Amino acid sequence: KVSGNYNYLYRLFRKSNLKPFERDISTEIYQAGNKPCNGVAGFNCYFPLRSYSFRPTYGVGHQPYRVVVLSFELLHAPATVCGPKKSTNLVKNKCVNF
């Protein structure tokens, strides 16, 4: 949007590293400092999900982008999805290799 696209919000702080196929929904502050802190922020308490910066007049490396990943499992269950196999002419009244 000309005035900005900030409806979504990206998470930055997670105190435990994740593994493949893992999500995060919690917004708990990354309390690295041992000083007392809970709920409302304060001394060394920064919100995980940081804001955006997105507008059309931007330059390089800051425009909104979309990423998709195609994944699948290997044959443990019966194979399910694959594309067409190319064919050719069928031929009538003539010797071929059917």
């Binding site: 702080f13 060394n44 920064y46 931007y58 330059g59 800051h62």
Partner: protein
């Protein structure tokens, strides 16, 4: 554990929020530039209010954080840069008095009135008409009349307001546990933690002193030639043994001297380079100037400049539907938005200045990869120097003839070499000693050793020794010609100009001696020199993340500032001056004055 990670996320959050909000503020400024409406003024004022509140909050957050136990170099530098806020640790009365006095000084300078006492209703204004009546006049009675009446009604709010400024700044630095506010000016250069290269604040002024002492013979020769040719061409008043009075400074303080070069034309019977026919034959315009700038960048070897210069940047001045200033404006709006706005004009010197602004844009593109604290050079003289590098490369006739700005049978003989060496001299060394004078005097006044009324002797003593500028009548209590300079009343560290020109000359020598260029030494051009572009691009990217003296000695070979490159490019200049200054006596006597 310790506050290492807390400081890390603190700097990170500041960088993100500063990027966002400063982008909004620059957006408001650019909206004002594109269109001037009072609502735009209110919007940018609100953006500035929000930004000031955010900066004060960040400084308050960073106030407690120490520097001694944290040993990370980048973290240390960023934290010490963030903790500094300026004049907020004082009491509010001093701050509000400072605001009022600076505002009233700005008002008295902006609307300070002087013109002909003949027709004051509608005449030439402060600029540029006063320039064309001082520097383009045949009689001097009106010239000195206006010169010495200029300070009789304006300096009254220039000298004592300067004193109030200096006392308030000194007391603020005292609250900051420092001595003066020019020390804070030069403190942007500060870096520590490197063995052997401990970096105080006085080495800057000492090095500047050495560089000016090296410069002094060059200006001695230059003023000798100027005096000889003015006595040959101006037999009107000035005596054959006198000097150059205050009515013949050519500017409001005597900075540029290309206009006075008219009185010091050695040879006018030999043709020189001119691009009027070449610019009205193929119809050169701002579009074509930018295209050939792209070609220049390609030939040098630097990579391409991003698309913000082809679509987002308005290539032309804003027509005549609206009205706005057309000062050279290279704006880094943020996140890859690089724009250049001016009142586009085609001239060889304007060619150089446009490439200077485009070098600014290239440097902005380079340091855009860094966070907000690192979105600037280790010194504030890097930007103008790196921009003017390509201009000084283009100050030579070689690639101007290469781009077809004149026929290839035009002689690249010795006369154009000598004349353009003298032109560069009048461009830079014609104002450098004045920079020495103003910066030394302002260091003294900021520190406070010099009485406010002593400036009559010592400063003028320098004018009796370094530049050769006098006055037919001594100045009075409130005549403050240094304050007549535009930048001094604008809260400017006036040594960063000299440090900038030192940086640009050192880099010019680095790209002229390491690029295998030969022939006449000035003829070196960075175009068609791949290694020069490569090594320049290696340097102009990091910013302040590392110390600058080590990199400076890598690129050129100087531990700090040095005018040895300046005379290296001016070795043909120095040789010609020695060739011409043997006819008679050279120099001036201090005792004798008009």
């Amino acid at each position: 554990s310790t506050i290492e990670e807390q400081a890390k996320t603190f700097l990170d959050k500041f960088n993100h929020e500063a990027e966002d909000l400063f982008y909004q503020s620059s957006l408001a400024s650019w909206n004002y530039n594109t269109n001037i409406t009072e609502e735009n003024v209110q919007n940018m004022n609100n953006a500035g209010d929000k930004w000031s509140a955010f900066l004060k909050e960040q400084s308050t957050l960073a106030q407690m954080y120490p520097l001694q136990e944290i040993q990370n170099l980048t973290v240390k530098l960023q934290l010490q840069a963030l903790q500094q806020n300026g004049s907020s640790v004082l009491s509010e009365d001093k701050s509000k008095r400072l605001n009022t006095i600076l505002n009233t000084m700005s008002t008295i300078y902006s609307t300070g009135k002087v013109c002909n006492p003949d027709n004051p209703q509608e005449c030439l204004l402060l600029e540029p008409g006063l320039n064309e009546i001082m520097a383009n006049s045949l009689d001097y009675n009106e010239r000195l009349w206006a010169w010495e009446s200029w300070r009789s009604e304006v300096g009254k709010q220039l000298r004592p307001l300067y004193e109030e400024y200096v006392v308030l700044k000194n007391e603020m630095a005292r609250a900051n546990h420092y001595e003066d506010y020019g020390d804070y000016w030069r403190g942007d250069y500060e870096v520590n933690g490197v063995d052997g290269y401990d970096y105080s604040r006085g080495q800057l002024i000492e090095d500047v002193e050495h560089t000016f002492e090296e410069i002094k013979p060059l200006y001695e020769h230059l003023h000798a030639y100027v005096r000889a040719k003015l006595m040959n061409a101006y037999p009107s008043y000035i005596s054959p043994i006198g000097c150059l009075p205050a009515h013949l400074l050519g500017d409001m303080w005597g900075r540029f001297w290309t206009n006075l070069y008219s009185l010091t034309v050695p040879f006018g019977q030999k043709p020189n380079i001119d691009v009027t026919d070449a610019m009205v034959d193929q119809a050169w315009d701002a579009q074509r100037i930018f295209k050939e700038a792209e070609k220049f960048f390609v030939s040098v070897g630097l990579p391409n400049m991003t698309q913000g210069f082809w679509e987002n940047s308005m290539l032309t001045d804003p027509g005549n539907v609206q009205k706005a200033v057309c000062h050279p404006t290279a704006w880094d709006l943020g996140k890859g938005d690089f724009r250049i706005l001016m009142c586009t004009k085609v001239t060889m010197d304007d060619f150089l200045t446009a490439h200077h602004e485009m070098g600014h844009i290239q440097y902005d593109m380079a340091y855009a990869a860094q966070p907000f604290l690192l979105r600037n050079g280790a010194n504030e003289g890097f930007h103008e120097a790196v921009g003017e590098i390509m201009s000084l490369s283009a100050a030579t006739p070689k690639h101007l003839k290469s781009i077809g700005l004149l026929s290839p049978d035009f002689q690249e003989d010795n006369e154009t070499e000598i004349n353009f060496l003298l032109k560069q001299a009048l461009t830079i060394v014609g104002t450098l000693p004045f920079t020495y004078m103003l910066e030394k005097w302002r260091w003294m006044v900021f520190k406070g050793e010099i009485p406010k009324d002593q400036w009559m002797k010592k400063w003028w003593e320098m004018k009796r020794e370094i530049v050769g500028v006098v006055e037919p009548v001594p100045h009075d209590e409130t005549y403050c010609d240094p304050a007549s300079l535009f930048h001094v009343s604008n809260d400017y560290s006036f040594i960063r100009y000299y440090t900038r020109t030192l940086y640009q000359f050192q880099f010019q020598e680095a790209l002229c001696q390491a690029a295998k260029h030969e022939g006449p030494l000035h003829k070196c051009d960075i175009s068609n020199s791949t290694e020069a572009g490569q090594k320049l691009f290696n340097m102009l990217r990091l910013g302040k993340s590392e110390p600058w003296t080590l990199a400076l000695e890598n690129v050129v070979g100087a531990k700090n500032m040095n005018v040895r490159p300046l005379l290296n490019y001016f070795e043909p200049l120095f040789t010609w001056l020695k060739d011409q200054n043997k006819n008679s006596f050279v120099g001036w006597s201090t005792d004798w004055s008009p």
